[PDB]
Amino acid sequence: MRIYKGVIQAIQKSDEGHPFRAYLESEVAISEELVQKYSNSALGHVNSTIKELRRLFLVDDLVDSLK
16 A cells, blocks of 8 residues: 555655646556666656556546556
8 A cells, every 4th residue: 555655756756747637547567566667667757758658548547447
C-alpha cells in the first residue's frame, strides 16, 4: 500500500506541475512497485501517459489507481 505514500513523490514534486490525478493514471502499471518502476521505467512513463490518460477517464480508476 506504501504506493500511496510513495505517490507523495508526485505531491512533493511541486516542480513537476504538481500533478496528482494525472500521476495516478501511471500508478496502475506501476502499482506493483512505486520506486522500482519509477526509477527503472523512467521512459515508459512517457507513452503510458498519453495512452493511459484518455483510457483512465473512460474507466475512472483514479481513486482505485492506488490499488
